[PDB]
C-alpha cells in the first residue's frame with residue numbers, strides 16, 4: 001500500500017501510467033504487485049535518462065512505446081542500416097555506434113542479471129548494459145556507451161530511490177521480490 005503511494009510520489013505521472021499499462025497487458029494488478037510496479041517505473045526512468053545521456057538524438061527510444069510503433073522503429077532502422085533485425089524488442093538504438101541496446105536494472109548482483117540477459121536474447125548483434133541500485137554496472141564487452149558523467153547521474157538517481165525506499169522500510173521487501 002505504501003509502495004504504491006511511494007511509486008506515485010517518487011515517479012513522474014508519464015512513467016507511472018506507462019508502467020500500469022505494461023503490467024495490465026500481462027494481467028498483473030499494480031495495486032497488488034506493487035514491487036513489480038516500482039521495478040518497471042525505475043527501468044523506464046533509466047531508459048529515459050540514458051536516452052538524454054549524450055549527443056542530441058544520439059538515441060532512439062524503443063521502450064515505453066506500443067508494440068506496433070516499437071516494431072515500426074526497429075524495422076525502419078534495420079532497413080536503412082542493415083543491422084540484423086532483433087528477435088525481441090530492445091530499449092534503445094545508438095545512432096552513433098549503430099547498435100540496439102538492452103538496458104537492465106537489478107536488485108541482485110550485476111553479473112547474475114547480465115548472464116540471464118545474454119542467454120535470454122542471444123542475437124550477438126545487440127548491446128547489454130546493466131545498472132544496480134548500489135552503483136554497480138556491467139556492459140557488453142565492457143563498453144559503457146555513455147560518458148562517466150551521465151552514467152553516475154543515473155546511479156545517483158538509483159541510489160536515492162534505494163534510500164528513499166529504505167526510509168519507508170519498503171526496500172527489504174523490494175530487494176527480496178526480484179524474480
Ligand SMILES: CCCCC(=O)C1=C(O)C(=O)c2c(O)c(O)cc(O)c2C1=O
Pocket residue numbers: 043063089090091102103104105
Ligand atoms: C520474460 C519475457 C517477457 C518480456 C518482458 O516482460 C520484458 C520486456 O518487454 C522488457 O523490455 C525488459 C527490459 O527492457 C528489461 O531491461 C528487463 C526485463 O526483464 C524486461 C522484460 O522482462
Ligand SMILES: [Cl-]
Pocket residue numbers: 009010011012013
Ligand atoms: Cl514526481
Ligand SMILES: [Mg+2]
Pocket residue numbers: 061063064065
Ligand atoms: Mg516514449
Ligand SMILES: [Mn+2]
Pocket residue numbers: 043091102103104
Ligand atoms: Mn531493458
